[PDB]
Structure 1
Amino acid sequence: MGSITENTSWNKEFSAEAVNGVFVLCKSSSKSCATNDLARASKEYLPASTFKIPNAIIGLETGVIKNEHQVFKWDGKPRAMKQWERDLTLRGAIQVSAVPVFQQIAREVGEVRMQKYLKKFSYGNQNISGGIDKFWLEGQLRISAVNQVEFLESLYLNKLSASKENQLIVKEALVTEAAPEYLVHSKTGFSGVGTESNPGVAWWVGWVEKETEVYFFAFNMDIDNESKLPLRKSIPTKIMESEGII
């Protein structure tokens, strides 16, 4: 937000796992960000499942999602993951990253409204070409790690162009770790393993509330093998542990 500085000593955690990626960590009270790689922090990637955050907000703003108690019913027709073949709440759909639930939300939102909200949210390159139910997974939408933390800061502050109520609803849906000393809100994403010399992207984005401080973060990495997927949490977790945050 206010400043950004490269800290190449965080590269130790990437090097140990042979990962090409970036971590951006911003401290709210000092309005200052740090990253291991300023260049990659500005590079723009498919959001994949991280797009569930804006999509949920927009679904609520448009009334497509009634409220946090709506149940997305399973129609019994097979889905790509057994964990998706069941009725889901909004939190449940976000937590398991149920693609087909959010494809249907996008379809009902429609292109004109989706375009309007991504403009209000300043979300990425705001390019929703590629089909209304796939632009964030295989279409032309791209967002950087810096843009992710800017968006998440706005959500945390209830400053997005949506009701505070709907921003609070989506925040509750994103809580992933609760301790007496700190609270973590987060979302993963994974575009797939990509092509030969054209790897996919994996993301972990979110924020940590600790004492009266708030830390916004966004991680992404190249990925060509699902077996590396847990590194999208363990590398950023080790960095935030070394920083004394969690």
Structure 2
Amino acid sequence: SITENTSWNKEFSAEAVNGVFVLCKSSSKSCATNDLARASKEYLPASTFKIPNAIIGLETGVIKNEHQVFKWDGKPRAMKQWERDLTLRGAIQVSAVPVFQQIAREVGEVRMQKYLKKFSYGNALEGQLRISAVNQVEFLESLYLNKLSASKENQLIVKEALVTEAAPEYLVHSKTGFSGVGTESNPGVAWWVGWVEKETEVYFFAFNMDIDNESKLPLRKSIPTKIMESEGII
């Protein structure tokens, strides 16, 4: 059950942004959003696909365990932070695409296909697979509860890998995504998805927006944060 909240439309209007935020307490059986229509509309997952990819990599034993080191082959890559040896968390945090391209190559298209169906994930950083903000939140819940078709052990490994902010009374698991600058008529998409544990409570969130100007990128974080802080979540 998803319900519409117009009280935050001042932020989207002031920033000239077309996007959607979905935030749920306890269980994804009652969520809130700024745009009902967009909440269920499906966009390219971009780098948020690293989450299911990592689970599948470990399930198939392509990634041997949590302590796996992905050696850099020494060839130039697209960004500097990727030009080094990386751990699972390292590769997820700097978002090193070639590391995860290589994992998926070994997994094979047919195996990946199957597990995705199994996870109810969705319909690459540009392909044929798309996912909604409602879909993302339902998937992240299952991961938190250990409910995915995967060993409990492997879901825990990816759960720790996704930790982005830690405090004595709250913990944040999250991942950004960004498909690239687009046209006014063919815009890119930016993502931030995750969940917050606070007190004995748990909050699931997923945000996306169109992006035709690169400098509008920080708003994928500032807007969801303005909201979540106003709710007393962080």
| TM-score range for the pair, normalised by the shorter chain length | over 0.9
Superposition deviation, residue 75 in structure 1: 0.5
Secondary structure at the counterpart of residue 26 of structure 1: strand
Q: Indicate the residue corresponding to 2:159 in structure 1.
A: 171
Secondary structure at the counterpart of residue 118 of structure 1: helix
Superposition deviation, residue 195 in structure 1: 3.3
CA contact (8 A) 2:194 2:206 kept: yes
* Equivalent-residue separation in structure 2 for 1:18 and 1:72 (angstroms): 41
* Equivalent-residue separation in structure 2 for 1:218 and 1:41 (angstroms): 9
What is the CA deviation profile of residues 146-182 of structure 1, one whole-angstrom value per residue up to 9, with x for unaligned ones?
0000000000001000011000000100000011111
Q: Indicate the residue corresponding to 1:108 in structure 2.
A: 106
**Structure 2: unaligned runs, 5 residues or longer:** none
CA contact (8 A) 1:205 1:218 kept: yes
Secondary structure at the counterpart of residue 2 of structure 2: strand
* Equivalent-residue separation in structure 2 for 1:196 and 1:203 (angstroms): 18
TM-score norm. by structure 1 comes to: 0.92
Kindly report structure 1 stretches of 4+ aligned residues shifted beyond 6 Å: none
TM-score norm. by structure 2 comes to: 0.97
CA contact (8 A) 1:13 1:239 kept: no
Superposition deviation, residue 196 in structure 1: 4.3
Superposition deviation, residue 82 in structure 1: 0.3
* Equivalent-residue separation in structure 2 for 1:78 and 1:106 (angstroms): 20
Match of 1:203 among 191, 211, 230: 191
Q: Indicate the residue corresponding to 2:208 in structure 1.
A: 220
* Equivalent-residue separation in structure 2 for 1:112 and 1:29 (angstroms): 32
CA contact (8 A) 1:13 1:238 kept: no
* Equivalent-residue separation in structure 2 for 1:29 and 1:155 (angstroms): 13
Q: Indicate the residue corresponding to 2:129 in structure 1.
A: 141
Superposition deviation, residue 30 in structure 1: 8.2
CA contact (8 A) 2:28 2:141 kept: no
* Equivalent-residue separation in structure 1 for 2:52 and 2:11 (angstroms): 30
Give the CA RMSD over aligned residues. Answer: 1.0
What is the count of residue pairs matched by the alignment?
Answer: 231
**Structure 1: unaligned runs, 5 residues or longer:** 124-136
Report % sequence identity: 100
Superposition deviation, residue 16 in structure 1: 2.3
